[PDB]
Amino acid sequence: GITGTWYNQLGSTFIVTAGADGALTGTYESAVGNAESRYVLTGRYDSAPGRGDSPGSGTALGWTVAWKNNYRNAHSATTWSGQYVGGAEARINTQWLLTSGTTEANAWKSTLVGHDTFTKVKPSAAS
Amino acid sequence: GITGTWYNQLGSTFIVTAGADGALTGTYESAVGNAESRYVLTGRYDSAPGRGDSPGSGTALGWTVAWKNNYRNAHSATTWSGQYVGGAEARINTQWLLTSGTTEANAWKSTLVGHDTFTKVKPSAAS
Amino acid sequence: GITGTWYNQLGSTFIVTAGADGALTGTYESAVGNAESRYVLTGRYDSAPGRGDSPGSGTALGWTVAWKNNYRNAHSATTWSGQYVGGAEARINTQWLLTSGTTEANAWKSTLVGHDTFTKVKPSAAS
Amino acid sequence: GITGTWYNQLGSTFIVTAGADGALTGTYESAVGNAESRYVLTGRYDSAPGRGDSPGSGTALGWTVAWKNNYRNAHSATTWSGQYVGGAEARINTQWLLTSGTTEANAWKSTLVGHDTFTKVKPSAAS
Numbered sequence: 001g002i003t004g005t006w007y008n009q010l011g012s013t014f015i016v017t018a019g020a021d022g023a024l025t026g027t028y029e030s031a032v033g034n035a036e037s038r039y040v041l042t043g044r045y046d047s048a049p050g051r052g053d054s055p056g057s058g059t060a061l062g063w064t065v066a067w068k069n070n071y072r073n074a075h076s077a078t079t080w081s082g083q084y085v086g087g088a089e090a091r092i093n094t095q096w097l098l099t100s101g102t103t104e105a106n107a108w109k110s111t112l113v114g115h116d117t118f119t120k121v122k123p124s125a126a127s
Numbered sequence: 128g129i130t131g132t133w134y135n136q137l138g139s140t141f142i143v144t145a146g147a148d149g150a151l152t153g154t155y156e157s158a159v160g161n162a163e164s165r166y167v168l169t170g171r172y173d174s175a176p177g178r179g180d181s182p183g184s185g186t187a188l189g190w191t192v193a194w195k196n197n198y199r200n201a202h203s204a205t206t207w208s209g210q211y212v213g214g215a216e217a218r219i220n221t222q223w224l225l226t227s228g229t230t231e232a233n234a235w236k237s238t239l240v241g242h243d244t245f246t247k248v249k250p251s252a253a254s
Numbered sequence: 255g256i257t258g259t260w261y262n263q264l265g266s267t268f269i270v271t272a273g274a275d276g277a278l279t280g281t282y283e284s285a286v287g288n289a290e291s292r293y294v295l296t297g298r299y300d301s302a303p304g305r306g307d308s309p310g311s312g313t314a315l316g317w318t319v320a321w322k323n324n325y326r327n328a329h330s331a332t333t334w335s336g337q338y339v340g341g342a343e344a345r346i347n348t349q350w351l352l353t354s355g356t357t358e359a360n361a362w363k364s365t366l367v368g369h370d371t372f373t374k375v376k377p378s379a380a381s
Numbered sequence: 382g383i384t385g386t387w388y389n390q391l392g393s394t395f396i397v398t399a400g401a402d403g404a405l406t407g408t409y410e411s412a413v414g415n416a417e418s419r420y421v422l423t424g425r426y427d428s429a430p431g432r433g434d435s436p437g438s439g440t441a442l443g444w445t446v447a448w449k450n451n452y453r454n455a456h457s458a459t460t461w462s463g464q465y466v467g468g469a470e471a472r473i474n475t476q477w478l479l480t481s482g483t484t485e486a487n488a489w490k491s492t493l494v495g496h497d498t499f500t501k502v503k504p505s506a507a508s
Contacts, residue, residue: 022167022193035434040149042169044193046202049228058228058237062191062206066149066171070432073325075173079189079206081224083237095238097208097222101176101185110185110210111222113240178324180289276421276447294403296423298447300456303482312482312491316445316460320403320425329427333443333460335478337491349492351462351476355430355439364439364464365476367494 001086002045002059006118007032014041014118016063022047028065036071045084058083061092076100080116092118128213129172129186133245134159141168141245143190149174155192163198172211185210188219203227207243219245255340256299256313260372261286268295268372270317276301282319290325299338312337315346330354334370346372382467383426383440387499388413395422395499397444403428409446417452426465439464442473457481461497473499 002018016026024043031037043063051057062081067074082094094116102110129145143153151170158164170190178184189208194201209221221243229237256272270280278297285291297317305311316335321328336348348370356364383399397407405424412418424444432438443462448455463475475497483491 022195023169024191036432038434040171042150042171043191043206044167044169044204046193046195046200046204046228048195048200049202051202051228054228054230056230057202058230058234060193060203060226060228062193062204062224062226064151064170064189064191064206064208066173066187066189068149068173068175070429071327071329073173073175075176075178075184075325076187077171077173077189077208079170079191079208079224081191081204081206081226081238083226083228083234085231085234093234093237095224095226095240097189097206097224099187099189099208099210099222101173101178101181101187101210103181103183103185104212107185107210107212107220110220111208113222175324178290180292276449277423278445294425296404296425297445297460298421298423298458300447300449300454300458300482302449302454303456305456305482308482308484310484311456312484312488314447314457314480314482316447316458316478316480318405318424318443318445318460318462320427320441320443322403322427322429327427327429329430329432329438330441331425331427331443331462333424333445333462333478335445335458335460335480335492337480337482337488339485339488347488347491349478349480349494351443351460351478353441353443353462353464353476355427355432355435355441355464357435357437357439358466361439361464361466361474364474365462367476 001090002061002084002092004120006092006120007122008116008118009122010116012116016041016043018045018047020047024061024063030067036069039065039067039069041065043080058085058093074100090120094118128217129188129211129219131247133219133247134249135243135245136249137243139243143168143170145172145174147174151188151190157194163196166192166194166196168192170207185212185220201227217247221245255344256315256338256346258374260346260374261376262370262372263376264370266370270295270297272299272301274301278315278317284321290323293319293321293323295319297334312339312347328354344374348372382471383442383465383473385501387473387501388503389497389499390503391497393497397422397424399426399428401428405442405444411448417450420446420448420450422446424461439466439474455481471501475499
């Protein structure tokens, strides 16, 4: 379900393997098709999401990307927290926090918040 | 700096190894001293935090815990996003998101937000 | 004449000191006002540009920026070759070469060419 | 790798030190064996050329020589832009721009372009 490639609605993609131990491992590409925009991803997911009181519930998950690779260091990291929903219309609905390293005086403004909806498909076109 | 044990201000602790590749790996113990309250932690940090325009800046990092182990499955995961500050008074200042798997109808209320300040020491007492 | 700040016509600026020995030393800011976009500049200029057969001739100069700093590594370097012209309308007219590190198979396409005209002033506005 | 002496295929040589900060510093000798043909060289190189998407890529670099010393002033400067390739057959493949100071009317013809391939060895013979 979760293993594979995901697209947000803004130009980014990631590939992830969801392992039997609850691990998420992959790569996040902040600009689709840009091979220099790839960063390590790591996280965790609920590997036994079934519940009797709440049937049909999504699968909780989270991951982190530190925005450092051989081409960029934004001295920050994003974490996404969300849930996977399967079915015809599979998606991962998330909220994210991006924290940048700051001086003490600037710590109050170190963290941005946002949201991303990831889908298995996006509109696409031949070149 | 980051490698070691951290305490929040509410009863939890974690141990982490910060590896040369930017990896964070460890275990999160949601109740100090309770060996059944330990969960896998994984994340990322900025392994080259130095900057000329902003000297003295913290080290960005993030990690995830899915709250599933052999004793509990809360069908949720927390991600913490923050920065490490070193020195006499070392700390990791974070914000967190906890997402629970939900039905579609309840997705609007799937995610809690909070904050944690981690320190290397906490008040402690002999038994 | 050359010592000071220069603006190209596209959003970049640099500051340079032209020393009595023919040295150019400074910093290149690829996006004006963006303190994370600053890179070391170094170069040379003709420190005795006067000529009897060609009075009123510009001052030849060149400099290099490798596009590596604490926030970015584009694995490339630009060199600008040009001349300073003084007067009411001072400018540095340049041509540039940007070479990126490539594999052998791609070496044929490692180098871009362009041009930049630098002036001491650009249109500017209050915030 | 880069530090040392380099020969082009036409009679010139230079010596360069590549410093940990990304600096290039040395001397360019436009005629091998002619001690009056030496000029200051300065430049920059990519001090962390490794890339995951492009393994085996060259090292981007550039430098400038203003053609003024105690014996000559050609009222011009050359910049070379290129990449270092290591290995058995080490080389620096470059393109260059030579700009001469000109009057305004002649500015259109102020800049020559060419290419130089530098190697660590050249054919040589006893006297």
